[PDB]
Amino acid sequence: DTVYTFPDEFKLGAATASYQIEGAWDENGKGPNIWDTLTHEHPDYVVDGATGDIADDSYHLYKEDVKILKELGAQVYRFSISWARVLPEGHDNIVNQDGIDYYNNLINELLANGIEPMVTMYHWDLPQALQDLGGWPNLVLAKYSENYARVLFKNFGDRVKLWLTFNEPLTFMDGYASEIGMAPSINTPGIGDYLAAHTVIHAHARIYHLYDQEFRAEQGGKVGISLNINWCEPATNSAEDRASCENYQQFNLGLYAHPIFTEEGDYPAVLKDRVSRNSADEGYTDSRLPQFTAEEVEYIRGTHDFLGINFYTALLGKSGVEGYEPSRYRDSGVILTQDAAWPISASSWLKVVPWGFRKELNWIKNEYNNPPVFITENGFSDYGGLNDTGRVHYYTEHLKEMLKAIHEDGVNVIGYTAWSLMDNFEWLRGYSEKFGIYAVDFEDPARPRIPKESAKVLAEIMNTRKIPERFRD
Numbered sequence: 001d002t003v004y005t006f007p008d009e010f011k012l013g014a015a016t017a018s019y020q021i022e023g024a025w026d027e028n029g030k031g032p033n034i035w036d037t038l039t040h041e042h043p044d045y046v047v048d049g050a051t052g053d054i055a056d057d058s059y060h061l062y063k064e065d066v067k068i069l070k071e072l073g074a075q076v077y078r079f080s081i082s083w084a085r086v087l088p089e090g091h092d093n094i095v096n097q098d099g100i101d102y103y104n105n106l107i108n109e110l111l112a113n114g115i116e117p118m119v120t121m122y123h124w125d126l127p128q129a130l131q132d133l134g135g136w137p138n139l140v141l142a143k144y145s146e147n148y149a150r151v152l153f154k155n156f157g158d159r160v161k162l163w164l165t166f167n168e169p170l171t172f173m174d175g176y177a178s179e180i181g182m183a184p185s186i187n188t189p190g191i192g193d194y195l196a197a198h199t200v201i202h203a204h205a206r207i208y209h210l211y212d213q214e215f216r217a218e219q220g221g222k223v224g225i226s227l228n229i230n231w232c233e234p235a236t237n238s239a240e241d242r243a244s245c246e247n248y249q250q251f252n253l254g255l256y257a258h259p260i261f262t263e264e265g266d267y268p269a270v271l272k273d274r275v276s277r278n279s280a281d282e283g284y285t286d287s288r289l290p291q292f293t294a295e296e297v298e299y300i301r302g303t304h305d306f307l308g309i310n311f312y313t314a315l316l317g318k319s320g321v322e323g324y325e326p327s328r329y330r331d332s333g334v335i336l337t338q339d340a341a342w343p344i345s346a347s348s349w350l351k352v353v354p355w356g357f358r359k360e361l362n363w364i365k366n367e368y369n370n371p372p373v374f375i376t377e378n379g380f381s382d383y384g385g386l387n388d389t390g391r392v393h394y395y396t397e398h399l400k401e402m403l404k405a406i407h408e409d410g411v412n413v414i415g416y417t418a419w420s421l422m423d424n425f426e427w428l429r430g431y432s433e434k435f436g437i438y439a440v441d442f443e444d445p446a447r448p449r450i451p452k453e454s455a456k457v458l459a460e461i462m463n464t465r466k467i468p469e470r471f472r473d
């Protein structure tokens with residue numbers, strides 16, 4: 001049963017994000033963020049015209065969140081901090097004590113209940129005052145991000161020892177690649193999304209160096225980043241289809257991980273070269289991909305204590321090019337599809353492909369020299385229901401695959417937090433797609449959290465530290 005047992009030091013828990021759960025969007029001095037703006041001004045972008053104005057009301061109900069974490073037996077709770085709740089103006093001139101108090105209250109409640117906090121600094125909720133300067137495409141945000149992080153380390157770092165600078169910049173950069181999509185819903189594909197990535201990488205590096213310089217000696221924690229990546233399986237066994245899948249990994253994960261996690265640093269060569277060529281062919285004087293200087297390459301490489309991975313699904317990749325000119329997908333040189341045979345979820349993008357998780361973990365091991373990997377998200381959507389057999393099976397299969405990666409393949413996976421502790425505001429999908437292991441009644445002002453079967457099974461896994469016999473192959 002070795003392949004079915006978690007390593008003794010491995011950390012298990014669950015995850016949320018601030019805008020998705022907190023509500024209290026303008027309470028007690030909190031400033032507006034880009035998701036307040038999107039859901040208020042553009043309800044036509046969101047299923048049901050839903051907003052995060054209340055969500056799970058975790059601003060008021062944080063003790064209930066801790067209660068269900070304790071019931072689950074979580075060792076770690078991954079949550080994010082709302083930048084505009086702490087710094088309502090985005091800049092560090094005004095610190096909102098109500099926000100400081102709130103996160104201290106949550107942290108202290110967690111620790112009093114034997115649960116370790118893991119904090120994501122940025123999970124998509126940029127202060128609107130900073131978006132008004134251009135947001136992530138404007139490199140001035142890297143210093144603003146450093147200053148935000150300093151406030152977080154100063155106030156919380158005596159008790160928080162696990163930090164993620166950013167969550168899914170591959171996703172939030174896409175808020176600069178569509179007029180109707182992710183906040184801030186700006187249509188600069190192939191140009192502004194790359195600028196956003198560039199700023200984020202710079203920001204991440206500044207935050208890491210800040211920790212080294214101002215906090216690490218006293219606080220003794222670890223700083224990483226959470227990167228999402230889909231497995232990309234060759235549509236056929238050809239060398240050409242394999243090349244396309246390598247392109248996919250480099251254009252999705254490598255975009256962020258090559259600058260940070262390799263000895264060489266910088267963007268992947270294929271990313272630089274394909275965008276350079278495409279830009280020239282379209283008549284641009286300058287490549288659409290921003291450049292790092294040698295000094296910047298050296299500053300950015302090595303800025304990590306672990307790699308956070310968000311894993312959900314797989315795609316099929318074949319040789320070719322598609323998408324609009326200009327765009328990151330077109331630049332990436334792969335044609336992406338889904339296999340009809342893969343089980344479905346309530347989310348168009350998410351098919352159940354558990355073996356893809358093991359393949360991805362091996363790809364990461366080989367590319368980045370087996371970094372410590374913390375799975376910061378993994379989970380499954382349905383439309384509702386407590387007898388969530390699909391979710392149960394998603395978890396048991398993904399955990400089995402991860403355990404094979406650890407035990408059979410030697411991948412240094414160090415922790416895992418299920419997405420999500422409870423049903424929450426699923427971005428443009430509103431409350432229509434359910435990812436929780438706890439259900440939440442969004443028509444009940446008290447927002448009760450109630451366990452699904454998946455919460456019961458995960459509790460059993462966390463308690464026994466193994467995959468139960470009935471779920472084994």
Ligand SMILES: [Cl-]
Binds near residue numbers: 236237238
């Ligand atoms: Cl074949």
Ligand SMILES: [Cl-]
Binds near residue numbers: 469
């Ligand atoms: Cl049994």
Ligand code: NA
Binds near residue numbers: 095151154
């Ligand atoms: Na402060």
